[PDB]
Amino acid sequence: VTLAELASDIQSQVKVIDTYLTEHNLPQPTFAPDSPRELPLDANVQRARLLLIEKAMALSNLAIGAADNLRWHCMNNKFDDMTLHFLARYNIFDAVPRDEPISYAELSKKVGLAEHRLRRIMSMAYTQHYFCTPKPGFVAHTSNSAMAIGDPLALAWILHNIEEVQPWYSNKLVDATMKWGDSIDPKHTGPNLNAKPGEEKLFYEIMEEDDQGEWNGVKGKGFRLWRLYDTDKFFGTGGAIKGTNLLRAFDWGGLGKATVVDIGGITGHLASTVALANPDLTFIVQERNQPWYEKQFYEQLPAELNGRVSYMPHDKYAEQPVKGADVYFMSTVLHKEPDDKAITILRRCVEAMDPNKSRLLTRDIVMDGGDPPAEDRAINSKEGSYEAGLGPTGVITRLNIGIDFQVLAVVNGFERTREEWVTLFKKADPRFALKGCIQTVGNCAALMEWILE
Amino acid sequence: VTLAELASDIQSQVKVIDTYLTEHNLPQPTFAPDSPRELPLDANVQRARLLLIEKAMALSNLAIGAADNLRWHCMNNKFDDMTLHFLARYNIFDAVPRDEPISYAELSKKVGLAEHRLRRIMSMAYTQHYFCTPKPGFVAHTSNSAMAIGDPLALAWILHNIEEVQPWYSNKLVDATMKWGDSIDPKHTGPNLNAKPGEEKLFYEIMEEDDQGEWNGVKGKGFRLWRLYDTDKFFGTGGAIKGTNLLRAFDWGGLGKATVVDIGGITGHLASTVALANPDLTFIVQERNQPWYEKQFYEQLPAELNGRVSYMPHDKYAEQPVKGADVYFMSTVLHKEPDDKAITILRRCVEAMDPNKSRLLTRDIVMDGGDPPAEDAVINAINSKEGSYEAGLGPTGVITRLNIGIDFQVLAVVNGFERTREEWVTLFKKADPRFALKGCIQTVGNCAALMEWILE
Numbered sequence: 001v002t003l004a005e006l007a008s009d010i011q012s013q014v015k016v017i018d019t020y021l022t023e024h025n026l027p028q029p030t031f032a033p034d035s036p037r038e039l040p041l042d043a044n045v046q047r048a049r050l051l052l053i054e055k056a057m058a059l060s061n062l063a064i065g066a067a068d069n070l071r072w073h074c075m076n077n078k079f080d081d082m083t084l085h086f087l088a089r090y091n092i093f094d095a096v097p098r099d100e101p102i103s104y105a106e107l108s109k110k111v112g113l114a115e116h117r118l119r120r121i122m123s124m125a126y127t128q129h130y131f132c133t134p135k136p137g138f139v140a141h142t143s144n145s146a147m148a149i150g151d152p153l154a155l156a157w158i159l160h161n162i163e164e165v166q167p168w169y170s171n172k173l174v175d176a177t178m179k180w181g182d183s184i185d186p187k188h189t190g191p192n193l194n195a196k197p198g199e200e201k202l203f204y205e206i207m208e209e210d211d212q213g214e215w216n217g218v219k220g221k222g223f224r225l226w227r228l229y230d231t232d233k234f235f236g237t238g239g240a241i242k243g244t245n246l247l248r249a250f251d252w253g254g255l256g257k258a259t260v261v262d263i264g265g266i267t268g269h270l271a272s273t274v275a276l277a278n279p280d281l282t283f284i285v286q287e288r289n290q291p292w293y294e295k296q297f298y299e300q301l302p303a304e305l306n307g308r309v310s311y312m313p314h315d316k317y318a319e320q321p322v323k324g325a326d327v328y329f330m331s332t333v334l335h336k337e338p339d340d341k342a343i344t345i346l347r348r349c350v351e352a353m354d355p356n357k358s359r360l361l362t363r364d365i366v367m368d369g370g371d372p373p374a375e376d377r378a379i380n381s382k383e384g385s386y387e388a389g390l391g392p393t394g395v396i397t398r399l400n401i402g403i404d405f406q407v408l409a410v411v412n413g414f415e416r417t418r419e420e421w422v423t424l425f426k427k428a429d430p431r432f433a434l435k436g437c438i439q440t441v442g443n444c445a446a447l448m449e450w451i452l453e
Numbered sequence: 454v455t456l457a458e459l460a461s462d463i464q465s466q467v468k469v470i471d472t473y474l475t476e477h478n479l480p481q482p483t484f485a486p487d488s489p490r491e492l493p494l495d496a497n498v499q500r501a502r503l504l505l506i507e508k509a510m511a512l513s514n515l516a517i518g519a520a521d522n523l524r525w526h527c528m529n530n531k532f533d534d535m536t537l538h539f540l541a542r543y544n545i546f547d548a549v550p551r552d553e554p555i556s557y558a559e560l561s562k563k564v565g566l567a568e569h570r571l572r573r574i575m576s577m578a579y580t581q582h583y584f585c586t587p588k589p590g591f592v593a594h595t596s597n598s599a600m601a602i603g604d605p606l607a608l609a610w611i612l613h614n615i616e617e618v619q620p621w622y623s624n625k626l627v628d629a630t631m632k633w634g635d636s637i638d639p640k641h642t643g644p645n646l647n648a649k650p651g652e653e654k655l656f657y658e659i660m661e662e663d664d665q666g667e668w669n670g671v672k673g674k675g676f677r678l679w680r681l682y683d684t685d686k687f688f689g690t691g692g693a694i695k696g697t698n699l700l701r702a703f704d705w706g707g708l709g710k711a712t713v714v715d716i717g718g719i720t721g722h723l724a725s726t727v728a729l730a731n732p733d734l735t736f737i738v739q740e741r742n743q744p745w746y747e748k749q750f751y752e753q754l755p756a757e758l759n760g761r762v763s764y765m766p767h768d769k770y771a772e773q774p775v776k777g778a779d780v781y782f783m784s785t786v787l788h789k790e791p792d793d794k795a796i797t798i799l800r801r802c803v804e805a806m807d808p809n810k811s812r813l814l815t816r817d818i819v820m821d822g823g824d825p826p827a828e829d830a831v832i833n834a835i836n837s838k839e840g841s842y843e844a845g846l847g848p849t850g851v852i853t854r855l856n857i858g859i860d861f862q863v864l865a866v867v868n869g870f871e872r873t874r875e876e877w878v879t880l881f882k883k884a885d886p887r888f889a890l891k892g893c894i895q896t897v898g899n900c901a902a903l904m905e906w907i908l909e
């Protein structure tokens with residue numbers, strides 16, 4: 001592929017998006033804070049967006065060239081993360097007004113970072129389109145930075161990765177691999193490289209036990225786990241894996257008056273998203289209890305739900321106490337479970353299921369891709385062997401791998417192909433059949449519907 | 454700016470590059486291993502390339518959108534580094550043949566990484582155009598990965614950043630800032646957050662003292678410093694800051710038979726690059742000695758030089774023992790020196806200089822940009838300028854990005870900093886009021902300028 005071919009590909013994809021926008025009289029994405037945060041969910045628009053991203057990234061890579069790529073990457077990449085670190089820890093997103101500029105001097109005063117160093121940090125942020133400088137000596141927001149204003153969930157994501165995942169786990173993965181090999185034991189992770197036998201610590205033990213700190217309403221014990229729950233919420237409130245995409249991936253309204261048991265449902269935020277849009281559904285959120293859990297669960301719970309979403313403490317490996325529910329639902333649970341543990345959970349579900357009335361729904365990455373929702377005969381040419389966003393340089397592929405590495409790093413988890421999912425479920429119970437595997441375009445996760453035939 | 458406007462700007466820049474390659478019958482860059490590793494040095498080509506990178510990065514960013522940029526960035530960015538970590542530590546660049554594919558099973562066996570985990574690691578590499586999979590179950594190189602084959606300097610750069618700068622310094626910089634503020638003390642860095650007073654460890658102390666390891670022919674004491682010297686050579690052998698760019702930024706041949714004193718010259722590799730191209734030049738490489746230094750200095754030295762490049766142990770802060778040399782030269786020395794220490798070094802140079810015969814040459818980042826070489830105007834057509842910045846500079850310029858990356862690298866390890874042209878002039882004039890900036894030459898595509906100083 002050449003620079004000219006990439007450019008031409010880019011032109012075609014932009015034309016599809018630009019046409020849609022203008023046809024529907026929709027505002028154009030820009031770097032201004034008032035810009036739309038995403039493009040339309042129309043499947044053709046999203047396919048063009050995903051291809052556009054991939055091509056643009058290839059074009060920048062090709063123009064940098066082989067001599068400079070490795071050289072520049074190991075120089076700069078780490079500093080984009082560091083810049084974020086500063087931005088979060090000094091609360092700079094909130095300190096810059098959303099719609100007015102602020103001088104470096106007054107920004108400095110507000111956040112307590114000396115003006116010289118502040119200037120340096122901001123300068124790196126600008127090159128990734130986080131903030132901009134509209135006039136000498138002044139800072140203003142961009143669309144990318146403005147979305148973090150007033151959002152602790154965004155800061156949670158920044159900090160969890162930079163202060164936990166990367167120094168404790170991903171920086172150490174090579175060493176962990178050389179020590180324990182290709183293991184699926186969650187104890188064979190970075191923090192235990194020099195631990196004595198029996199003194200190993202699990203990621204989720206560290207999260208729920210550490211008491212030296214505070215986060216967003218939770219002080220002391222488990223503040224890191226609470227921040228982790230905020231990260232989970234961050235991926236449900238916007239973007240690629242947002243909760244409202246669940247509504248297009250399964251006919252929740254067709255269940256009528258029904259109960260959904262949400263196994264490993266975190267703080268029930270995803271359950272609430274489905275229940276708010278589907279007034280006839282009742283949700284039982286099953287999760288491991290914590291000293292602050294019930295307090296935060298009911299503070300978050302929308303009163304509009306009128307109690308249709310409730311919390312039931314539960315061990316996902318134990319007998320399932322709700323029998324014959326319409327739906328047993330697990331969102332991004334099983335990709336942290338090796339086959340034997342996944343089978344245990346699945347068999348607990350099977351025992352409680354009525355085979356002629358219960359479904360088991362899972363939301364997880366399907367590494368080779370799910371099917372588009374029904375609502376969505378190709379007209380303009382498809383590329384290569386893969387759907388848009390997938391393939392070895394696809395941007396959804398990239399997201400899939402990033403999540404694969406995220407669970408590999410903290411618990412030695414892994415993502416699975418569709419074939420691997422069907423094989424695992426059939427090992428849990430031979431009656432299991434995959435009825436639907438729906439991946440909305442732009443999403444990395446599929447909603448899989450399983451029944452026992 | 455909109456996606457259509459970025460797409461239109463991209464077309465304009467690609468047209469410049471594409472037309473030049475066709476009209477000069479030059480091979481196109483591709484991701485194949487046989488691709489050219491860079492574009493031509495022609496200034497118009499490099500200006501279009503730098504703009505092209507900037508516009509394409511803006512386009513991918515805008516198309517990802519505000520909702521997904523930060524979500525995806527904090528997920529994926531760290532794993533591009535971790536991918537390289539695995540590739541370097543398992544020696545995978547050398548294990549994949551340059552021009553043939555290799556199966557995952559065979560590669561797994563060659564490097565001792567289980568096939569299931571190997572496939573995962575390689576899959577992330579592919580997304581950044583490091584390696585590719587030409588057929589199911591097989592791995593092959595790309596241009597980006599093939600440049601590291603047989604090159605320990607490339608692996609030195611990966612491992613120095615991922616196993617030292619990032620975990621010891623960059624990830625702790627917020628904490629260092631909260632403890633010591635905007636300090637210029639090299640002791641006020643990540644490793645010393647809990648150090649007792651007087652027991653702080655300097656970066657260069659750790660580099661030269663640690664003896665628990667080995668790198669590329671140096672075992673034991675100073676292996677990390679040896680690896681750091683390999684990374685310095687890595688930036689001289691190719692790409693933006695390569696040593697041969699020095700040859701176009703100053704008239705070295707115009708010096709005639711002359712001596713250049715290379716203060717803080719690492720292992721003399723940059724001195725050798727200029728000496729090879731200029732047979733009448735003698736270089737004295739002045740550097741702090743190490744137990745392995747002289748052995749490695751002479752092993753590496755090209756015999757073609759016939760001894761014109763020599764090593765003289767020297768403390769850059771001490772009196773300059775070579776008097777009246779034609780050139781006193783410092784390449785990327787002063788950006789690790791706060792004003793007071795830089796002034797000490799410069800005044801040592803002054804005392805040794807003959808004001809009517811000696812020059813002081815420095816190569817360093819000029820944050821707001823130097824001037825193009827003489828030849829550019831000669832080789833060049835009627836260009837018009839738009840906007841406030843030369844191509845590559847400005848708040849989203851990719852040379853600006855580079856400049857800042859280096860600024861942060863020295864901030865992290867020694868609390869160093871890069872300077873503007875005005876700040877360089879002010880600094881030199883404080884060292885000695887006679888100092889005058891004669892030339893400040895930045896080749897297009899380079900982030901560093903070669904500055905010529907004289908005492909008037």
Ligand code: NA
Nearest residue numbers: 264286314316
């Ligand atoms: Na549970």
